[PDB]
Structure formats: C-alpha cells, structure tokens
Design an enzyme around this catalytic site. Structure first.
Site, short mmCIF file in Angstrom:
data_model
loop_
_atom_site.label_atom_id
_atom_site.label_comp_id
_atom_site.label_asym_id
_atom_site.label_seq_id
_atom_site.Cartn_x
_atom_site.Cartn_y
_atom_site.Cartn_z
N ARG A 145 70.98 -0.77 20.40
CA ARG A 145 69.75 -0.81 20.15
C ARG A 145 69.08 0.66 19.96
O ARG A 145 68.21 0.91 18.91
CB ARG A 145 68.60 -0.98 21.45
CG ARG A 145 69.10 -0.28 22.63
CD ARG A 145 68.11 -0.65 23.81
NE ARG A 145 68.64 -0.12 25.09
CZ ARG A 145 69.53 -0.24 25.99
NH1 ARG A 145 70.34 -1.28 25.58
NH2 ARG A 145 69.84 0.58 27.16
N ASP A 159 67.30 6.23 17.77
CA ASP A 159 66.63 5.76 19.08
C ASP A 159 67.58 6.16 20.15
O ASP A 159 68.48 6.69 20.05
CB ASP A 159 66.16 4.18 18.98
C1 LIG Z 1 67.18 14.28 25.47
C2 LIG Z 1 67.00 14.27 23.80
C3 LIG Z 1 67.58 13.24 23.18
N1 LIG Z 1 67.05 13.39 21.92
C4 LIG Z 1 67.65 12.51 20.58
C5 LIG Z 1 66.47 11.74 20.01
C6 LIG Z 1 66.85 10.89 18.92
N2 LIG Z 1 65.77 10.13 18.10
C7 LIG Z 1 65.74 9.15 17.54
O1 LIG Z 1 67.23 8.64 17.49
C8 LIG Z 1 64.76 8.33 16.51
C9 LIG Z 1 63.59 8.44 17.22
C10 LIG Z 1 62.58 7.82 16.86
C11 LIG Z 1 62.51 6.77 15.64
C12 LIG Z 1 63.81 6.66 15.09
C13 LIG Z 1 64.78 7.62 15.40
C14 LIG Z 1 66.22 7.32 14.76
C15 LIG Z 1 63.76 5.86 13.90
C16 LIG Z 1 64.04 5.16 13.04
C17 LIG Z 1 63.96 4.32 11.72
C18 LIG Z 1 64.50 4.56 10.41
N3 LIG Z 1 63.99 3.14 9.83
C19 LIG Z 1 63.46 2.32 10.51
C20 LIG Z 1 62.88 0.98 10.53
C21 LIG Z 1 62.41 0.46 11.51
C22 LIG Z 1 62.35 1.08 12.63
N4 LIG Z 1 62.83 2.15 12.72
N5 LIG Z 1 63.45 3.00 11.72
N6 LIG Z 1 61.76 0.56 14.12
C23 LIG Z 1 62.24 -0.68 14.66
C24 LIG Z 1 60.46 1.22 14.40
C25 LIG Z 1 60.70 1.82 15.75
N7 LIG Z 1 59.71 1.42 16.81
C26 LIG Z 1 59.02 2.76 17.71
O2 LIG Z 1 58.07 2.33 18.26
C27 LIG Z 1 59.66 4.13 17.71
C28 LIG Z 1 58.83 5.23 18.19
C29 LIG Z 1 58.96 6.46 17.76
C30 LIG Z 1 60.48 6.55 17.25
O3 LIG Z 1 61.15 7.75 17.61
C31 LIG Z 1 68.23 10.86 18.53
C32 LIG Z 1 69.11 11.66 19.36
C33 LIG Z 1 70.70 11.56 18.74
F1 LIG Z 1 71.25 10.79 19.67
F2 LIG Z 1 70.94 11.17 17.62
F3 LIG Z 1 71.25 12.63 19.15
C34 LIG Z 1 68.82 12.51 20.32
C35 LIG Z 1 66.16 14.47 21.95
N8 LIG Z 1 66.14 14.74 23.14
#
Ligand SMILES: Cc1cn(-c2cc(NC(=O)c3cc4cc(c3C)C#Cc3cnc5ccc(nn35)N(C)CCNC(=O)CCCCO4)cc(C(F)(F)F)c2)cn1
Length: 286
Positions: A145, A159
């Site tokens: 996921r 995510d």
């Molecule tokens: C302790 C800590 C950890 N992190 C950390 C954060 C991230 N962040 C992340 O990956 C991260 C965070 C994030 C969004 C996305 C990502 C990739 C994205 C995307 C994306 C690109 N195309 C699409 C198409 C449909 C779709 N999403 N989507 N959905 C289905 C909607 C989703 N619906 C929602 O409601 C989400 C609400 C806010 C979401 O915030 C990634 C990493 C990592 F693992 F990549 F390093 C580490 C920061 N601090």
C-alpha cells in the site's frame, strides 16, 4: 535546517481534480510548469511537520523512492509536489492484475502477472530498500500500500499518505490513539517494540509475500489479536501458490526470529534482481 527544500510558485501549480482524501492531507492531480502532471499534497490544518517532512523528503532521492519536486508556501494551503504515478499504489495494482479480478493494458500483459513481472516488481522495492538501509533510514510501515506504480511498471515507495485512513483494516489501533501494522511487524517490534533496519527486512518478506499472493492481506486468516499471537509464537506465512520454492527461500531468509540472523536487504535484492533478468528457459522451469 541542514538541507534546503526547493520552492514552486503557486502560479505553476494548476489543480485538475482530486485523487484521494486523507484525514490530514489531500492529493490532487495537477500540472507544474517548473509541462507535466504532478501529484500535490494539501495540508489540512502541523506546519512544523510540513517543513520537517519536506526536509527529509528532499534528502531522499533514488530510483525507487517517489520523486519529490518541492513545496509551495506562498499561500495557504501548503503544498507538497510529488510526481504522478499512473497506476496508483502497488496493492491496488497487484489485486487488479490477479486471478481474482476483473484484457491487456499499456504497461502490462492481460494478466495474471507472470513470474518475470512479479520478480521485476519485487526487485525494485528491494532496490529502494537497500538505499534506505544504506542511509540507515527506517521505514516503519513497509507494505504494498505504501509503494506506487508508474507508467512503465516502475515501482517506487510511496505513502504512508493516509494509508491509515484508506487501508484502516491493515492497522491495529493500540490504545485510544495510534495504529500499528502488526501483520507487517517483526516479533521484536511487537514484543519489545523495537524497530531497526532488520525489522524492515522482515516487513519486506511480508511485502514479497503480498506480491506472489496478488495483493491479499497477510494473515487474512486471522483477526488482529490472533495475528499478534501467530507472529509471537513464531508461526510463518505459507508459500503462496504463485511463488516458486526458489523465492519462498528468500521470504524465510527475511523471517528469521533473531533480526541479525536475517539476510541483508542488499543480499535479498541481489537474489531478486538476478532472477528478474534471468533468461526465460530458466524461469519456465522454476
Ligand atoms: C517519519 C517520516 C516518513 N516520511 C516519509 C513520507 C513519504 N511520503 C509519501 O510517500 C507520499 C505521501 C503522500 C502522498 C503520496 C506519497 C508518495 C502520493 C502520491 C500519488 C502519486 N500519484 C497518485 C495517484 C493516486 C494517489 N496518490 N498518488 N492516491 C491514491 C491519493 C492518496 N490519498 C490520500 O489521502 C493521501 C493524503 C496525503 C498523501 O501524502 C515517503 C517516505 C519514503 F519512504 F519514501 F522515504 C517517507 C517522512 N517522515
């Protein structure tokens, strides 16, 4: 502020439509002019958790980590610009290409996903985890996921993002507040509640399990408490039907009870990568 985050003018960002809603964020499909499409995250308020994440998101740059483009603080709501991944998250991708649902596409065969495809997807997730483990970063919620699939079947780790709001069934709500993906958690994270890099390789074996199971939930057999027990007593997941014995050995290599008895993610990726580009005749026999 050790590193610096790039900024994008709000005039560049043009929201098209929403891609999903979270308890703390909103993802819209939008365009940027730096012209391509991007995925923006709108904060629902946390401002300190905005900059802190962006600083961390900027430092993490790799071929299997979701490409972070920058932020926009010249007018609320605050924005986080991510690249657009065509096929959404990996879990919803795997399910829609399994023998259960219900016809080819542009990036994928009619399906189900063959051994070569699954090994390709598995290697990319493994390759991205080596980078995080190389930086000694600890992804405490590793699952299908939290991995995104893009145009061309490229898989990147993406995510968190409201995964505790979308897939609420994958989390055990400890106490009044706080959720735990116990089905993806190792024994030392359940009992002593300690998370390490070796606690992530345990999660990857569970991720590797999801791939050859086509998106099914680990320990779907059980409830949350029963799942806690089975993991606590040291009961392993059974080899999925689509998984060859060659690959199930890699899963068990990630499922040693002593975290240091487990194989390194650099070694796991090495096995998965080799099987990926392996000639057809070698995989047909597997
Ligand atoms: C302790 C800590 C950890 N992190 C950390 C954060 C991230 N962040 C992340 O990956 C991260 C965070 C994030 C969004 C996305 C990502 C990739 C994205 C995307 C994306 C690109 N195309 C699409 C198409 C449909 C779709 N999403 N989507 N959905 C289905 C909607 C989703 N619906 C929602 O409601 C989400 C609400 C806010 C979401 O915030 C990634 C990493 C990592 F693992 F990549 F390093 C580490 C920061 N601090």
């Amino acid at each position: 502020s050790d590193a610096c985050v790039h900024h994008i003018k709000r005039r560049d960002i043009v929201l098209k439509w929403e891609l999903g809603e979270g308890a703390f964020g909103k993802v819209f499909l939008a365009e940027c002019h730096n012209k391509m499409l991007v995925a923006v995250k709108a904060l629902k308020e946390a401002r300190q958790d905005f900059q802190r994440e962006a600083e961390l998101l900027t430092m993490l740059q790799h071929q299997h980590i979701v490409r972070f483009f920058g932020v926009c603080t010249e007018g609320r709501p605050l924005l986080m610009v991510f690249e657009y991944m065509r096929h959404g998250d990996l879990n919803r991708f795997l399910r829609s290409h399994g023998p259960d649902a219900k016809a080819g596409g542009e990036d994928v065969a009619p399906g189900p996903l063959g051994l070569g495809q699954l090994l390709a997807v598995a290697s990319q997730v493994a390759a991205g985890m080596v980078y995080l483990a190389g930086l000694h970063f600890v992804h405490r919620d590793l699952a299908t996921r939290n991995c995104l699939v893009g145009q061309g079947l490229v898989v990147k780790i993406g995510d968190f993002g409201m995964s505790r709001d979308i897939y609420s069934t994958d989390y055990y709500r400890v106490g009044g507040r706080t959720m735990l993906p116990i089905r993806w958690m190792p024994p030392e994270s359940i009992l002593y509640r300690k998370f390490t890099t070796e606690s992530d390789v345990w999660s990857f074996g569970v991720v590797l399990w999801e791939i050859f199971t086509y998106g099914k939930q680990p320990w779907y057999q059980l409830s949350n408490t029963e799942a806690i027990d089975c993991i606590t007593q040291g009961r392993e997941l059974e080899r999925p039907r689509a998984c060859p014995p060659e690959v199930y050995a890699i899963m068990r290599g990630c499922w040693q009870r002593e975290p240091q008895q487990r194989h390194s993610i650099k070694d796991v990726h090495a096995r998965l990568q080799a099987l990926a580009q392996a000639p057809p005749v070698y995989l047909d026999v597997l």
